[PDB]
Design a protein around this ligand. Sequence first.
Ligand SMILES: Cc1cc(-c2ccc(S(N)(=O)=O)s2)cnc1-c1cccc2ncccc12
Ligand SMILES: Cc1cc(-c2ccc(S(N)(=O)=O)s2)cnc1-c1cccc2ncccc12
Ligand SMILES: Cc1cc(-c2ccc(S(N)(=O)=O)s2)cnc1-c1cccc2ncccc12
Ligand SMILES: Cc1cc(-c2ccc(S(N)(=O)=O)s2)cnc1-c1cccc2ncccc12
Ligand SMILES: [Zn+2]
Ligand SMILES: [Zn+2]
Ligand SMILES: [Zn+2]
Ligand SMILES: [Zn+2]
Lengths: 251, 251, 251, 251
Amino acid sequence: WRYGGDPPWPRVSPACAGRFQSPVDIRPQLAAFSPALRPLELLGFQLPPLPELRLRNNGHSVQLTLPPGLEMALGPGREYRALQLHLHWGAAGRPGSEHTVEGHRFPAEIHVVHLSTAFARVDEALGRPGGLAVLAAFLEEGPEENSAYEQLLSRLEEIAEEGSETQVPGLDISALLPSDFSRYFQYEGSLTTPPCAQGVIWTVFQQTVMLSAKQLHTLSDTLWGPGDSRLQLNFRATQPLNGRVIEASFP
Amino acid sequence: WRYGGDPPWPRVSPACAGRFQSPVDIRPQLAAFSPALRPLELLGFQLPPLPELRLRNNGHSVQLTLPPGLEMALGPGREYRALQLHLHWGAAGRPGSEHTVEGHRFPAEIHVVHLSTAFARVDEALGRPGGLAVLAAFLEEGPEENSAYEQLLSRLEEIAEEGSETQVPGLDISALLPSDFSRYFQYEGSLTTPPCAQGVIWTVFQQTVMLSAKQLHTLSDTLWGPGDSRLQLNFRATQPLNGRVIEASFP
Amino acid sequence: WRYGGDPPWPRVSPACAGRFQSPVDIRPQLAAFSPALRPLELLGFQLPPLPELRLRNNGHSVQLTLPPGLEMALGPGREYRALQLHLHWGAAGRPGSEHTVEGHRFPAEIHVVHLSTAFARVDEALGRPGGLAVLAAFLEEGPEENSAYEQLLSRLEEIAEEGSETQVPGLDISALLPSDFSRYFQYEGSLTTPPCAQGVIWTVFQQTVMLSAKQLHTLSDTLWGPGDSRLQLNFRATQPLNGRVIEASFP
Amino acid sequence: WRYGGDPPWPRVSPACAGRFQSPVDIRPQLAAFSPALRPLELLGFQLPPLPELRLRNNGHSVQLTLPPGLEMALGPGREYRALQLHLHWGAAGRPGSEHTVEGHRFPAEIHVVHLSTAFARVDEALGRPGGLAVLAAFLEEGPEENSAYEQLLSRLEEIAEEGSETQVPGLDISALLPSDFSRYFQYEGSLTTPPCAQGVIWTVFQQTVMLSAKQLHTLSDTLWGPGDSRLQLNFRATQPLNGRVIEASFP
Ligand SMILES: Cc1cc(-c2ccc(S(N)(=O)=O)s2)cnc1-c1cccc2ncccc12
Ligand SMILES: Cc1cc(-c2ccc(S(N)(=O)=O)s2)cnc1-c1cccc2ncccc12
Ligand SMILES: Cc1cc(-c2ccc(S(N)(=O)=O)s2)cnc1-c1cccc2ncccc12
Ligand SMILES: Cc1cc(-c2ccc(S(N)(=O)=O)s2)cnc1-c1cccc2ncccc12
Ligand SMILES: [Zn+2]
Ligand SMILES: [Zn+2]
Ligand SMILES: [Zn+2]
Ligand SMILES: [Zn+2]
């Protein structure tokens, strides 16, 4: 499977033809303020340099494999463990986030994918209610260089080839995310690539992360994908809510 | 019986000349708003990949057989089980929906046919009020490839020949339907082919679903009907309301 | 089965414990105006004097059996034939209507019971959507002797014994009903006695029918029922709407 | 294990000492209104008289086994099938509900236990978030005999001895529940008996159901439990929220 071309995703994974897919257009007006949504809590995201982490160009994204012991709570009794994070991006002067807000697409997007602690294996969690959870943040152009992101972006040249990997020092994974953990949207959806399993809890931060224009250009211009092709515009088309209500943790 | 030339349908089925037939032209300004029309309830429609579903070219449409367990309600205690779905379509740049809206014919139309749970058999329900209910949705052209419809459309080549059939993976049947289950038109009418039985409750979604130009081309151009003849323009002409008022679930 | 005492009605017929029973309390402010509800049409209700009709004290009510050829339509394509009518009433100083309006119980009530023309036999219509329709009107005191009701009431003395019957000349049955057929409530419920079968379309007139004080006393004070007891208070307690929305033909 | 005596529940079943147990005390003023909570959908619950259903004294409660095809939804795509229902009650002069509201215990409580359709088997669903869902309604004292409850309460004398069982006619299960399906409290908790598995979505109806005092007495006073003693006060003490915020579908 690939972005742009065939095979059609429902041929690859039936679940990709579900009614409750991701990503979606967040319309803050139509969102339901729910005071029960408490601030997100992360434990163990401040990683030391060793052991090193695998960073891979899988031909679809750049993926950082995360070690054991990164814990995340969506609220009391809703506990998760981090597995991996990765990015979706555009091209030169073309934004490439997955989620939109009132039709606006942002330059890029970070996903941190988590497994519910009630499940030992991802294959048992797929398609089950609350089995996986993804934390998402928009990346926008800012004036300053983001130095947390520079640790990853400076390594992209080594994995320009599709299907290539390198090892990188551990870092503060939470410094790749916004500092406001109390203001977010939350909805139930799917993985935005095959196998497109539903039951996934998406938390989209309201605060954005700022990268420099150079950093954004490094992300979008360095990696190669299937064919003689650049790895760009690696985002799925917006998917209808189909009656789902996005909640918001703030009025 | 066939679409196109003879026989005239009142000769095969005299019920086709009844006073209360389908389809009809929907004129939203003349529809009667009733707040008693609640959102449609469709449960059990998210099918697993196995078992597989029979898909058949019957000469008149492409038809997907639905298993037990797809429950639908039009109101409190007014419950239904889905039997089958099928489609009506046009030809190259000629629309072939059955219902029209203020004279406008849409590219195509999906029908999900149901049996009242008050009747153990279809043949007891034929001609009895509310024995059969059909959910109808309009298919329009949009920019994106539609995932739910691709699962069906990619299999038509396998069944191009009149009378041929195949077996397809389970899919979310509800994904084939518009976003807002609270917005529809409703009236009583007939089956749109022989035997033209009356007492059918038609529910026509207000919102459409979108397929790509190529998807709509695949639908109209792949299947063959009776004779050495294409399966196309498989819609009945618009019938008079004869005093019936179409209702609306929305002001 | 009897009013007042045992056996409990669900043991006689399990449908008497359905969620969607009659009668109900009509709260006109919670009723949904639907302009699809047109004036009721009756045809054949003006009977010649011969053949005579049977008027029976069945222990629960006084019931008039109607002949063939009385036709009623709730709207275009919604056609019914009248089977019988009967009354429900209270006792001296106590109202006995079945339906209530904003908690007000009226002196008495008339029910005219019909079978959908889609069905040859009552037993096939029971529990089926729209299979049976009842027209209901409240009876109140006015200043004049009602001459249509007098033809029935003047014979009650003859059928005072439980299980007794008499022959009465045909009359204008529609003169037992209000002259305003355009203003009414309509909802879906049940028979108000065993078998308590659901799917029954109830139409309750806004306008009442007027009987003299003496006529109302004849109704409540002449007939005898099970035991050595008066046939009085022959109404079921108000049943909860349980989420059903009563419609009104007027704003 | 049993109600009243030894052993203490965390010895039989250490999950009973988990941090997120049920039942809880609902303080409506501290509940979080979330407008994403939509009306409950229950299809299939109107059962015919045959086949019959197993009703069983199990020493801890009276339990009705429900057949396949009772479908229930908490939200879009979030579907369940009903397994069984059972009751919790007090004794002569003392209430026996499990949940309390602002400290108030109600005479009794009904639980309808469901399995997520994302899981083929109950044993897969235990301890998994959303795996099981219970619908709970309080039973209060009212003036009238309840028709729906009488079908069960009248059959209790035939199963009075611990471990005995009977077959009952099919009944409308929805008729045992409150009128307004849009108004409920919801939180995540546990089974209220061993094995005390967590992950259970509890939905507690705002509105009560009403039973005659005779009916409540039949419930509390007819059944025999463990030892040679009565089956009564079969409720668990209220448990701490430990940070859980209870949600309400209504302001
Ligand atoms: C968790 C997972 C997510 C994904 C994703 C696809 C798309 C996303 S995104 N764009 O965040 O929704 S996440 C793919 N495969 C796996 C996966 C699938 C199967 C086994 C796995 N074992 C360990 C780690 C990951 C495994
Ligand atoms: C359910 C049914 C729908 C249809 C349809 C004809 C036309 C439509 S459409 N365009 O939805 O109105 S649906 C035709 N025949 C049957 C049918 C008719 C008679 C007996 C049957 N027995 C088993 C299954 C189907 C039976
Ligand atoms: C139609 C019918 C109504 C009723 C009742 C009718 C109406 C009520 S009331 N209070 O109007 O709802 S109870 C009882 N039995 C039958 C009935 C049941 C079965 C066969 C019948 N054949 C002829 C006429 C009536 C038959
Ligand atoms: C579904 C189920 C609920 C319960 C319940 C215990 C307590 C409740 S209550 N008070 O609703 O919370 S429900 C007990 N056993 C089963 C059950 C039923 C069937 C198979 C099972 N296998 C393993 C464990 C439990 C099984
Ligand atoms: Zn992603
Ligand atoms: Zn059709
Ligand atoms: Zn009656
Ligand atoms: Zn319980």
